[PDB]
Design an enzyme around this catalytic site. Structure first.
Site, short mmCIF file in Angstrom:
data_model
loop_
_atom_site.label_atom_id
_atom_site.label_comp_id
_atom_site.label_asym_id
_atom_site.label_seq_id
_atom_site.Cartn_x
_atom_site.Cartn_y
_atom_site.Cartn_z
N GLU A 62 71.78 59.99 3.07
CA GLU A 62 72.84 59.02 3.10
C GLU A 62 72.18 57.62 3.29
N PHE A 89 72.07 73.87 2.16
CA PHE A 89 70.68 74.17 2.62
C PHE A 89 70.20 75.29 2.30
N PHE A 90 69.22 74.99 1.50
CA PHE A 90 68.70 76.66 0.59
C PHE A 90 67.59 77.35 1.40
N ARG A 91 66.41 76.45 2.02
CA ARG A 91 65.34 76.95 2.55
C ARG A 91 65.23 76.02 3.88
C1 LIG Z 1 71.42 80.19 4.31
C2 LIG Z 1 70.31 81.23 3.90
C3 LIG Z 1 70.02 81.93 5.07
C4 LIG Z 1 70.70 82.00 2.76
O1 LIG Z 1 69.97 82.75 2.14
P1 LIG Z 1 69.81 82.61 0.61
O2 LIG Z 1 70.31 81.71 -0.12
O3 LIG Z 1 70.20 84.00 0.15
O4 LIG Z 1 68.29 82.46 0.30
P2 LIG Z 1 67.39 83.84 0.54
O5 LIG Z 1 68.33 84.46 1.72
O6 LIG Z 1 66.77 84.09 -0.57
O7 LIG Z 1 66.13 83.21 1.56
C5 LIG Z 1 65.67 81.91 1.64
C6 LIG Z 1 64.82 81.58 2.84
O8 LIG Z 1 65.81 81.51 4.11
C7 LIG Z 1 65.40 82.17 5.04
N1 LIG Z 1 65.96 83.28 5.53
C8 LIG Z 1 66.96 83.78 4.73
N2 LIG Z 1 67.34 84.77 5.75
C9 LIG Z 1 66.82 84.87 6.66
C10 LIG Z 1 66.90 85.80 7.88
N3 LIG Z 1 67.75 86.74 7.96
N4 LIG Z 1 66.22 85.11 9.08
C11 LIG Z 1 65.41 84.20 9.07
N5 LIG Z 1 65.38 83.42 7.94
C12 LIG Z 1 65.92 83.66 6.85
C13 LIG Z 1 63.79 82.29 4.70
O9 LIG Z 1 63.08 81.29 4.99
C14 LIG Z 1 64.02 82.73 3.37
O10 LIG Z 1 62.87 82.58 2.45
P3 LIG Z 1 61.86 83.76 2.42
O11 LIG Z 1 61.18 83.79 3.82
O12 LIG Z 1 62.76 84.91 2.25
O13 LIG Z 1 60.85 83.42 1.35
C15 LIG Z 1 68.90 80.20 3.50
O14 LIG Z 1 69.68 79.59 2.25
C16 LIG Z 1 68.62 79.21 4.72
O15 LIG Z 1 67.94 79.75 5.77
N6 LIG Z 1 69.02 77.85 4.54
C17 LIG Z 1 68.47 76.95 5.29
C18 LIG Z 1 69.18 76.97 6.64
C19 LIG Z 1 69.07 75.53 7.34
O16 LIG Z 1 68.05 75.31 7.64
N7 LIG Z 1 70.01 75.07 7.79
C20 LIG Z 1 69.69 73.78 8.83
C21 LIG Z 1 69.37 74.28 10.20
S1 LIG Z 1 70.33 75.31 10.90
C22 LIG Z 1 71.76 74.16 11.49
C23 LIG Z 1 71.31 73.24 12.84
O17 LIG Z 1 71.10 72.10 12.17
C24 LIG Z 1 71.43 73.41 13.95
C25 LIG Z 1 71.43 72.14 14.82
C26 LIG Z 1 71.40 72.52 16.49
C27 LIG Z 1 71.56 73.94 16.60
O18 LIG Z 1 71.73 74.03 18.05
C28 LIG Z 1 71.82 74.79 15.94
C29 LIG Z 1 71.85 74.79 14.52
C1 LIG Z 2 85.05 54.63 3.16
C2 LIG Z 2 86.10 53.38 3.69
C3 LIG Z 2 85.36 51.93 3.41
C4 LIG Z 2 87.33 53.72 2.52
O1 LIG Z 2 88.20 52.86 3.12
P1 LIG Z 2 89.74 53.72 3.12
O2 LIG Z 2 89.79 55.09 3.06
O3 LIG Z 2 90.48 52.78 1.94
O4 LIG Z 2 90.37 53.13 4.71
P2 LIG Z 2 90.91 51.64 4.73
O5 LIG Z 2 90.15 51.09 3.54
O6 LIG Z 2 91.99 52.06 5.11
O7 LIG Z 2 90.09 51.17 6.09
C5 LIG Z 2 89.88 51.94 7.12
C6 LIG Z 2 88.90 51.38 8.18
O8 LIG Z 2 87.62 51.11 7.32
C7 LIG Z 2 86.90 49.83 7.34
N1 LIG Z 2 86.94 49.37 6.39
C8 LIG Z 2 87.46 49.46 5.11
N2 LIG Z 2 87.27 48.65 4.13
C9 LIG Z 2 86.40 47.63 4.85
C10 LIG Z 2 85.80 46.48 4.32
N3 LIG Z 2 85.84 45.85 2.95
N4 LIG Z 2 84.98 45.98 5.15
C11 LIG Z 2 84.86 46.54 6.57
N5 LIG Z 2 85.30 47.36 6.85
C12 LIG Z 2 86.08 48.17 6.06
C13 LIG Z 2 87.75 49.11 8.52
O9 LIG Z 2 87.09 49.65 9.69
C14 LIG Z 2 89.02 49.89 8.46
O10 LIG Z 2 89.93 49.76 9.35
P3 LIG Z 2 90.99 48.32 9.64
O11 LIG Z 2 90.10 47.52 10.12
O12 LIG Z 2 91.32 48.00 8.07
O13 LIG Z 2 91.97 48.85 10.66
C15 LIG Z 2 86.52 53.79 5.10
O14 LIG Z 2 87.35 54.87 5.12
C16 LIG Z 2 85.22 53.71 6.03
O15 LIG Z 2 84.80 52.83 6.29
N6 LIG Z 2 84.90 54.95 6.43
C17 LIG Z 2 83.77 55.03 7.34
C18 LIG Z 2 82.44 55.12 6.41
C19 LIG Z 2 81.28 55.09 7.63
O16 LIG Z 2 81.08 54.78 8.61
N7 LIG Z 2 79.99 55.82 7.04
C20 LIG Z 2 78.91 56.25 7.75
C21 LIG Z 2 77.99 55.23 7.93
S1 LIG Z 2 77.77 54.47 6.57
C22 LIG Z 2 76.43 55.28 5.98
C23 LIG Z 2 75.12 55.54 6.79
O17 LIG Z 2 75.06 56.28 7.60
C24 LIG Z 2 73.83 54.66 6.60
C25 LIG Z 2 72.77 55.06 7.17
C26 LIG Z 2 71.62 53.98 7.23
C27 LIG Z 2 71.77 52.97 6.36
O18 LIG Z 2 70.68 52.32 6.31
C28 LIG Z 2 72.90 52.66 5.79
C29 LIG Z 2 73.88 53.55 5.80
#
Ligand SMILES: CC(C)(COP(=O)(O)OP(=O)(O)OC[C@H]1O[C@@H](n2cnc3c(N)ncnc32)[C@H](O)[C@@H]1OP(=O)(O)O)[C@@H](O)C(=O)NCCC(=O)NCCSCC(=O)c1ccc(O)cc1
Ligand SMILES: CC(C)(COP(=O)(O)OP(=O)(O)OC[C@H]1O[C@@H](n2cnc3c(N)ncnc32)[C@H](O)[C@@H]1OP(=O)(O)O)[C@@H](O)C(=O)NCCC(=O)NCCSCC(=O)c1ccc(O)cc1
Ligand SMILES: CC(C)(COP(=O)(O)OP(=O)(O)OC[C@H]1O[C@@H](n2cnc3c(N)ncnc32)[C@H](O)[C@@H]1OP(=O)(O)O)[C@@H](O)C(=O)NCCC(=O)NCCSCC(=O)c1ccc(O)cc1
Ligand SMILES: CC(C)(COP(=O)(O)OP(=O)(O)OC[C@H]1O[C@@H](n2cnc3c(N)ncnc32)[C@H](O)[C@@H]1OP(=O)(O)O)[C@@H](O)C(=O)NCCC(=O)NCCSCC(=O)c1ccc(O)cc1
Lengths: 140, 140, 140, 140
Positions: A62, A89-91
Site C-alpha cells: 500500500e 499469500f502464496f509462499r
Molecule cells: C496457504 C498455503 C499453505 C497453501 O499452500 P499451496 O497454495 O497449496 O502451495 P503449496 O501447498 O504448493 O506450498 C507452497 C509453500 O507453502 C508452505 N507450506 C505449504 N503447506 C505447508 C505445511 N503444511 N506446513 C508448512 N508449510 C507449508 C511451504 O513453504 C510450501 O513450499 P514447499 O516447502 O512445499 O516448496 C501456502 O500458499 C502458504 O503457506 N502461503 C503463505 C502463508 C503466509 O505466509 N501467510 C502470512 C503469514 S501467517 C499470518 C500472519 O501474518 C500471522 C501473524 C501473527 C500471528 O500471531 C499469526 C499469524
Molecule cells: C476512501 C475514502 C477517501 C472514500 O470516502 P467515502 O467512502 O466516500 O467516505 P466519505 O467520502 O463519506 O468520507 C468518510 C471520511 O473519510 C475522510 N475523507 C473522505 N474524503 C476526504 C478528503 N477529500 N479529504 C480528507 N478526508 C477525506 C474523512 O475522514 C471523512 O469523514 P468526514 O470528515 O467527512 O466525516 C474514505 O473512505 C477514507 O478516507 N477511508 C480511509 C482511507 C485510509 O485510512 N487508508 C489507509 C491509510 S492510507 C494508505 C497507507 O497505508 C499509506 C501508507 C504509507 C504511505 O506512505 C502512504 C499511504
C-alpha cells in the site's frame, strides 16, 4: 526517509518513526506507471512463528501504490489514500528480503489500481496485492 | 506476550520482538467463534501523513483470525496461516485506539474464514478485513 | 420485473431480458440498510459440473447491493454502480434455491459497502460477497 | 460446447444449457499457463441500466480459470472449483464483445491463482478478476 516522493514541505510523521520506517521499507524506483520497493527481513517484520507477517507485505504494497499515486496527483490539488487492499499469500518468507514491484493497471479520475508482486531473494512470487487507491480533492 | 493462545512450549520469535509486539497489539477475548484485540495508536502505527497505515489494520486482523484458528487446530496436529486478506478502508484513524472484533463465519476442513471489524474510540467502523485462513497438517 | 426499485420512467433493458431476469432473480425486501433476494436453481444458473456457477452468486449480490443503493441515491441525482465484488465460495449448491441477504455496513459520500450472505435451502452459508458500490453525480 | 477442455466422457449439464452457454461464452486458447475466451454482448449479458452486469465478467473469468485448471489436474485425479473471485470494475461495457485473458500466476498443490483481464472491442481494460481455484482429490 525511505526515498518517498517529496511533494510537501512538511509531513505529519517523520518517516523513520512511521510503521514504514520502523520495519525498514525503502522505495527504489518510481514512475507514474511503475514503482519498486524492498525491505530486509528482521524480527520486526516477522510474527511469532518466524515468518514474515502478512500485514508486512500489505503495508509494503500500500505504501508503494499510494505514494506512486501521490507522486502524480499531489501537485494537482488531490490527495490519495488506500481504499482497499486484497492480498493473497502464496509462499511464506522466513528471512532474506521482500522485493515489491507495483504496476499501475487503471488510472481513473477517482480511483487508481495497482497490482503489486512481492518476491523473495530467489525471485519467487510469495504474495500479490491488488491496491485500489482513492483520489479526492484536498480538503483545506 | 500480547495474550496469544499458548499452544506450544516455545516459539520461533519472542512476541515483543515481532511486528505485532513492536506496534503493541494486545488480544482481549478469544473463543473458537469470536476474538477481540486492540492497540493504542502511536506514530509506529501511522504512516507519514499521520493516519494509521492500512497495513496495521490488516496485521491486527490477520493475527486475531489466524491465532483464533491456531487455538483450535494446533492440538489437532494442524497448522493455520493467513492465505488471503481483503481489507477495505472506510474512515481514517488519527489517534486513540483501534479495536478489532473477529467473527468466524465458516470453518471448513481446509479453510476457515473470519470477518474482522476495526473501530475507532467512538465506535465508528473504520475498516473491515475478510481473512481466509489455510489449515494444513503440520510438516514437523 | 424482479421487484426492483422503481426510480425511473424508462430503463434501457427490460428486466426479463437481463442477465438477472434470464436466470430468474427476484428481490423480496428492500430498505436503505438491508435487502433480501432469492432465485430458484435451474440449469441456467449452473455450470457443466451441475453446481451453481460462482458468477450466479456474484450477480445476485451485486444486483441486490447496487439496487438497494440506487433506491436511496437516485432521487438525489446520483448514480450507483458496482465497483468491486469479492466473493468467497464455502459450499457448493446443487439444486433448490439460493437466498441472499445484503447488510449495509458503510454509506460514504462516494462509496457504499454491503456484505451479502448467500444461503442454501438448509440455511447453510454457501457464499459471501463484499460489494463496494460507487456513487457518482449523474451525467446529463 | 463453448470449446471447454474435454476431460470426461459426459458432464452433469450440457454446456448450451448452463449459465455459460446461455450467455454465449466461448473459450479460444487454452494452455496450462494461459487461456482466452470471449462473448458477444447482448441483453442477456446486460443489467437493466444497459451495461454488462458485473456478474458476467466474473462468470467468464471463473470459467476460464477453473476450466484451465481442470484441463491439467483432472487426469491427475483431482477436482478444481472456484474458491474466491475478487473482481474490480474500471469501465462499463455497453456493447460489442468482452474478451478475457487468464494468466496463471501461482500453481500450488492445493490452490491455483489466475489473473483475468477483461477488455472491450477497443482493447481497453474494463475489469480484472483474481481467481483463486481450490484443487482437491475427487470424491467419486
Ligand atoms: C496457504 C498455503 C499453505 C497453501 O499452500 P499451496 O497454495 O497449496 O502451495 P503449496 O501447498 O504448493 O506450498 C507452497 C509453500 O507453502 C508452505 N507450506 C505449504 N503447506 C505447508 C505445511 N503444511 N506446513 C508448512 N508449510 C507449508 C511451504 O513453504 C510450501 O513450499 P514447499 O516447502 O512445499 O516448496 C501456502 O500458499 C502458504 O503457506 N502461503 C503463505 C502463508 C503466509 O505466509 N501467510 C502470512 C503469514 S501467517 C499470518 C500472519 O501474518 C500471522 C501473524 C501473527 C500471528 O500471531 C499469526 C499469524
Ligand atoms: C476512501 C475514502 C477517501 C472514500 O470516502 P467515502 O467512502 O466516500 O467516505 P466519505 O467520502 O463519506 O468520507 C468518510 C471520511 O473519510 C475522510 N475523507 C473522505 N474524503 C476526504 C478528503 N477529500 N479529504 C480528507 N478526508 C477525506 C474523512 O475522514 C471523512 O469523514 P468526514 O470528515 O467527512 O466525516 C474514505 O473512505 C477514507 O478516507 N477511508 C480511509 C482511507 C485510509 O485510512 N487508508 C489507509 C491509510 S492510507 C494508505 C497507507 O497505508 C499509506 C501508507 C504509507 C504511505 O506512505 C502512504 C499511504
Ligand atoms: C467505478 C467507476 C464509476 C469509478 O470511476 P473511476 O475509477 O474514477 O473512472 P472514471 O471516473 O475515470 O471513469 C471511467 C469510465 O467510467 C464511467 N463513469 C465514471 N463516472 C461516471 C458517471 N458519473 N456517470 C456515468 N459514467 C461514469 C465512464 O464510462 C467513464 O469513461 P469516460 O466516459 O469518462 O471516458 C468507473 O470505474 C466505472 O464505471 N466502472 C464500471 C462499473 C460497472 O460497469 N460495474 C458493473 C455494472 S453495475 C453493477 C451490476 O452488475 C448491476 C446489476 C443489476 C442491477 O440491477 C444493478 C447493477
Ligand atoms: C473450496 C472448497 C472445496 C474448500 O473446502 P473447505 O473450505 O475445506 O470446506 P470443506 O472442505 O470443509 O467442505 C465443504 C463442502 O465442499 C464440498 N467439497 C469439499 N471437498 C470436496 C471434494 N474433494 N469433492 C467434492 N466436493 C468437495 C463438499 O460439498 C463439502 O461438504 P461435505 O460434503 O464435506 O459436507 C469448498 O469450500 C467448496 O467446495 N466451495 C464451493 C465451490 C464452488 O461452488 N464454487 C463455485 C462453482 S465452481 C466455479 C465455476 O463457477 C465454474 C463455472 C464454469 C465452469 O466450466 C467451471 C467452473
Amino acid at each position: 526517509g525511505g526515498n518517498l516522493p517529496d511533494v510537501a514541505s512538511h509531513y505529519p510523521v517523520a518517516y523513520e518513526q512511521t510503521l514504514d520506517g520502523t520495519v525498514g521499507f525503502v522505495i527504489d524506483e518510481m514512475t507514474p506507471e511503475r514503482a519498486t520497493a524492498s525491505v530486509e527481513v528482521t524480527d520486526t517484520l516477522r510474527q511469532r512463528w518466524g515468518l514474515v507477517a502478512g500485514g508486512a507485505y500489505c503495508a509494503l504494497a500500500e505504501m508503494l501504490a499510494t505514494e506512486a499515486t501521490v507522486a502524480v496527483v499531489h501537485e494537482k490539488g488531490m490527495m490519495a489514500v488506500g481504499q482497499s487492499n486484497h492480498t493473497s499469500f502464496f509462499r511464506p518468507v522466513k528471512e532474506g528480503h521482500v522485493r515489491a514491484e507495483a504496476v499501475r493497471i487503471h488510472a481513473g479520475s477517482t480511483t487508481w489500481f495497482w497490482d503489486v508482486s512481492l518476491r523473495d531473494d530467489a525471485g519467487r512470487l510469495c504474495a500479490v496485492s491488488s491496491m485500489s487507491i482513492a483520489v479526492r480533492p484536498r480538503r483545506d
